[PDB]
Amino acid sequence: ATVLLEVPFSARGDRIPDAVAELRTREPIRKVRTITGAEAWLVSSYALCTQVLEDRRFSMKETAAAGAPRLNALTVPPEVVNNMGNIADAGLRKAVMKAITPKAPGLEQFLRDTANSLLDNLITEGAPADLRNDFADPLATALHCKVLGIPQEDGPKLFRSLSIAFMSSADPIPAAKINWDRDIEYMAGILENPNITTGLMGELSRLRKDPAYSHVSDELFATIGVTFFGAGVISTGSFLTTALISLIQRPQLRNLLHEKPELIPAGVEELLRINLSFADGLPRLATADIQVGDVLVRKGELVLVLLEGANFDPEHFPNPGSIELDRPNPTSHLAFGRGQHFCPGSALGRRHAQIGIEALLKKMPGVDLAVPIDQLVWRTRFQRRIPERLPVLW
Numbered sequence: 067a068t069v070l071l072e073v074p075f076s077a078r079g080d081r082i083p084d085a086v087a088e089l090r091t092r093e094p095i096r097k098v099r100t101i102t103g104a105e106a107w108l109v110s111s112y113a114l115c116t117q118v119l120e121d122r123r124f125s126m127k128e129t130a131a132a133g134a135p136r137l138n139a140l141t142v143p144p145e146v147v148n149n150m151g152n153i154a155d156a157g158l159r160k161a162v163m164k165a166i167t168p169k170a171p172g173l174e175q176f177l178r179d180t181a182n183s184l185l186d187n188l189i190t191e192g193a194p195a196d197l198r199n200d201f202a203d204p205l206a207t208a209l210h211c212k213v214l215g216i217p218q219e220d221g222p223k224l225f226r227s228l229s230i231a232f233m234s235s236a237d238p239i240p241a242a243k244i245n246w247d248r249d250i251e252y253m254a255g256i257l258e259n260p261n262i263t264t265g266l267m268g269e270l271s272r273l274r275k276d277p278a279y280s281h282v283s284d285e286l287f288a289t290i291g292v293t294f295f296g297a298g299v300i301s302t303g304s305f306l307t308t309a310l311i312s313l314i315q316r317p318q319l320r321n322l323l324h325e326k327p328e329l330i331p332a333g334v335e336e337l338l339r340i341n342l343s344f345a346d347g348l349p350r351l352a353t354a355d356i357q358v359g360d361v362l363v364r365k366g367e368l369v370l371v372l373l374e375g376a377n378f379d380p381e382h383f384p385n386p387g388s389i390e391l392d393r394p395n396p397t398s399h400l401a402f403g404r405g406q407h408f409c410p411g412s413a414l415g416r417r418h419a420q421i422g423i424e425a426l427l428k429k430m431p432g433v434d435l436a437v438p439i440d441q442l443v444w445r446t447r448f449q450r451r452i453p454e455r456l457p458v459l460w
């Protein structure tokens with residue numbers, strides 16, 4: 067006799083496990099056990115994933131309630147699970163959104179110059195190069211320092227928190243609180259620094275002294291900086307890293323995008339659709355009894371939305387494992403979520419990858435893995451799937 071299915075199925079981010087297709091066709095909502103020992107519903111078809119994400123009765127903020135079944139332990143204060151709600155209630159949503167657009171002046175040129183500079187340094191050092199630690203992550207870090215308006219030299223200090231902040235742990239993590247309190251204090255100091263006049267933190271620093279915002283807490287202003295740096299850098303760094311693997315594995319596609327770079331936006335959209343960067347389903351707590359497929363989810367139960375369940379669903383994306391640049395529904399994937407909590411940095415994440423890949427194909431058109439693919443070391447118990455090193459030659 068066996069147990070309930072345990073999630074996650076695999077930490078590998080280069081291929082989807084066969085178990086996902088069997089679950090989707092046979093039991094697209096199914097009971098699973100999480101690493102905390104809690105039970106949850108796993109949803110794995112495009113139709114049911116979209117239903118859950120569009121129904122606000124499946125709540126993200128209630129996942130932080132005491133005594134709720136948990137996917138993993140919180141690494142942030144519980145009020146921060148409601149981060150975007152707190153931002154909107156303070157009247158700051160429009161300000162935050164206009165600061166993280168890729169259309170900000172100098173931003174695209176900064177991204178291009180930084181990507182080229184990183185790749186030139188790698189070419190000078192000679193092969194093998196590590197495209198995660200010496201390209202994808204520094205590019206994500208540099209981009210978010212610029213978007214935030216904070217010194218580039220402070221990027222690596224803030225980055226150091228992320229290997230702990232985004233763990234997917236059964237128990238609370240002592241180091242997460244140490245790093246959180248320290249990073250909050252850094253961002254509080256940025257708000258009092260008169261040299262910080264640009265980017266998101268420059269705008270928040272001005273709004274803090276505006277009478278319309280005098281009753282917004284200093285804690286919220288600092289929290290916006292820490293959370294947007296952290297979520298943005300881990301999400302863009304990890305997506306670009308695993309998109310580069312998908313590209314390297316497909317020399318025909320790599321050659322086509324090198325010859326016709328005007329197809330890079332459509333290629334990136336497919337690379338988003340097939341991306342396995344999210345290591346766990348997205349969690350929601352049922353606030354009511356809700357019918358999902360054949361199952362009545364009860365109030366208080368945990369539901370997990372499996373993004374690669376939806377994004378590889380052949381009923382919505384025929385031939386789902388194939389990158390096809392002429393699909394009729396190309397942005398209808400769930401890589402950025404759906405509904406109330408749709409990613410606010412979607413446009414910035416697209417541009418980061420587009421410019422990173424464009425620069426790579428110009429400088430490194432023969433890029434290939436320097437080791438057999440089974441030699442990549444996949445990070446475990448983490449909210450993203452990423453290889454620890456990505457050694458390439460060219």
Ligand code: HEM
Nearest residue numbers: 150297298301302305348401402403407409410411414415
């Ligand atoms: C390719 C890059 C990215 C991917 C794949 C991605 C993916 C996602 C997904 C799937 C969600 C929904 C989570 C849920 O519903 O539980 C989300 C939300 C979020 N993302 Fe992104 N993201 C990316 C880039 C960014 C960037 C660049 C930023 C900020 C600079 C950012 C900040 C956020 C925030 C703050 C939320 C919470 C939204 C809310 O609760 O309403 N992300 N992201």
Ligand SMILES: O=C1N[C@@H](Cc2ccc(O)cc2)C(=O)N[C@H]1Cc1ccc(O)cc1
Nearest residue numbers: 142146147148149150231232292293296297
């Ligand atoms: O809990 C949150 N925390 C932050 C994201 C975050 C989590 C941990 C951390 O150290 C920094 C930011 C938020 O903006 N909203 C929510 C929901 C969330 C969680 C993870 C994620 O990848 C995206 C959204």
